[PDB]
């Protein structure tokens, strides 16, 4: 009883990368304590409080740097698009990317710049440069860290410098040597002023899949408070498998907690059929489609590149057909048996909410696999219908 539901709870959250956990290990420890003491109502009120903090958590990101750093293109690419300027995210009103003028552009000291730019409103600072980070940049970072906050040095316009070098020396172009020289110069000069060797993230302003942008996103996740990881995961653009999987895992944890909130303690059965639960979940499912870029509007462009209609293209995606007919409820019985033999399942006494949980979990895993397929839509289809059953040799194809 009590001891077994705490182990399922523990075993569920053990399955996730450390930087993706939306509750802290203290939260988990508290919740497990109450479950083990047979205080499930107390455990539920903790989960409710956690979920309220998660759902209302705002995200304010300060991007500080000079105008030559392409700050505008950087900010638009984050959002999928002497005074600070806000740029709300187009899909998430509670996310705001702020354009902060370069400290060198102003004439403030670091401490005065921070107070002028309202440093307490932000979750972290991005210090951006298209060139090298000056000693004033290092002084700013030092102040930010003294305020107990986080900063990240981002060197942008990497694609422009590689292009110039490539056109300069087409036959001896060494991509990795350019990157190493750029990063080392930036690192070595920040190390002299700053107490520790700060990481420097090399990025393209127009393509967040490239260079160090993936490692940046992982470090930002890892440094944020646990409850802020969900809204930050949602704010990412679903353009890499890692980013898609960050969203998948964050939403899977959230629906697990929602299941316990709604169904750990309810006891008169709600009744209905699986078809009724699915009807009730229809708007939730559409919200999930929107998180993953699977809504009809987003699927139009991709279907065109494949000379298909959205209806055609959706034949080859799994989420539309997940529930059909071998009956559905037998498929679900076996699914539940598989999962709950492994991680115990959700803490949900109410069948309605137990099944809502599994239906949402399944939809989330499917939507994420579909989104991953969208990254390489044409090639996947062309390989699928074409004859070859195996992968091509390395540099031939």
């Amino acid at each position: 009883g009590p001891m077994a539901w705490a182990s399922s709870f523990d075993a569920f959250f053990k399955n996730f990368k450390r930087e993706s956990k939306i509750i802290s290990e203290y939260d988990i420890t508290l919740i497990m304590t109450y479950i083990e003491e047979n205080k499930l109502q107390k455990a539920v009120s903790v989960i409710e409080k956690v979920l309220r903090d998660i759902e209302s958590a705002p995200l304010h990101i300060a991007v500080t740097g000079e105008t030559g750093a392409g700050k505008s293109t950087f900010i638009n690419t984050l959002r999928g698009v002497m005074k600070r300027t806000p740029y709300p995210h187009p899909k998430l009103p509670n996310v705001t990317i702020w354009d902060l003028p370069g400290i060198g552009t102003t004439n403030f000291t670091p401490q005065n710049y921070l107070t002028e730019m309202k440093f307490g409103e932000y979750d972290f600072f991005i210090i951006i440069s298209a060139t090298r980070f000056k000693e004033n940049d290092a002084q700013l970072a030092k102040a930010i860290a003294q305020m107990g906050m986080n900063f990240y040095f981002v060197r942008t316009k990497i694609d422009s410098d590689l292009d110039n070098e490539q056109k300069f020396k087409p036959k001896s172009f060494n991509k990795e040597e350019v990157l190493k020289n750029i990063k080392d110069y930036c690192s070595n000069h920040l190390q002299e002023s700053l107490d520790s060797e700060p990481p420097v993230f090399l990025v393209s302003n127009v393509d967040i899949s490239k260079y160090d942008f993936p490692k940046l996103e992982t470090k930002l996740l890892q440094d944020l408070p646990a409850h802020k990881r969900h809204v930050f995961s949602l704010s990412l653009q679903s353009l890499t498998e890692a980013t898609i999987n960050y969203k998948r895992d964050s939403l899977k944890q959230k629906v697990f907690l929602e299941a316990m909130k709604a169904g750990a303690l309810a006891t008169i059965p709600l009744g209905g059929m699986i078809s009724d639960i699915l009807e009730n979940l229809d708007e939730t499912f559409n919200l999930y489609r929107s998180y993953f870029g699977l809504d009809d509007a987003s699927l139009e462009n991709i279907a065109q590149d494949l000379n298909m209609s959205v209806d055609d293209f959706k034949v080859h995606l799994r989420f539309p057909h997940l529930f059909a007919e071998e009956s559905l409820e037998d498929k679900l019985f076996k699914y539940i048996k598989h999962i709950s033999s492994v991680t115990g399942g959700p803490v949900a006494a109410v069948t309605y909410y137990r099944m809502a949980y599994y239906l949402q979990n399944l939809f989330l895993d499917t939507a994420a696999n579909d989104a991953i397929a969208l990254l390489n839509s044409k090639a996947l289809f062309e390989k699928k219908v074409g004859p070859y059953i195996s992968e091509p040799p390395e540099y031939w194809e």
Side-chain angles (χ1 to χ4, degrees), residues 169-228:
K169 312 195 309 203
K171 304 298 187 179
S172 65
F173 174 56
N174 176 358
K175 170 200 287 194
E176 292 87 8
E177 179 187 341
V178 176
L179 296 177
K180 183 189 162 42
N181 293 338
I182 296 190
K183 173 168 297 177
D184 288 0
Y185 187 99
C186 291
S187 302
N188 283 339
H189 284 75
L190 297 178
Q191 287 168 207
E192 80 206 4
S193 324
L194 281 181
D195 232 328
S196 191
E197 315 82 331
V200 174
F201 302 87
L202 269 52
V203 309
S204 159
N205 261 1
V206 293
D207 186 354
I208 61 105
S209 75
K210 296 175 70 196
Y211 311 120
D212 297 327
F213 217 116
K215 289 179 296 284
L216 179 56
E217 288 175 335
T218 300
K219 180 43 146 180
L220 296 180
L221 273 166
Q222 176 54 239
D223 292 346
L224 281 167
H227 298 163
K228 293 235 176 186

Side-chain angles (χ1 to χ4, degrees), residues 1 105 180 255 303 325 345 388:
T105 278
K180 183 189 162 42
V255 302
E325 257 156 346
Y388 292 146

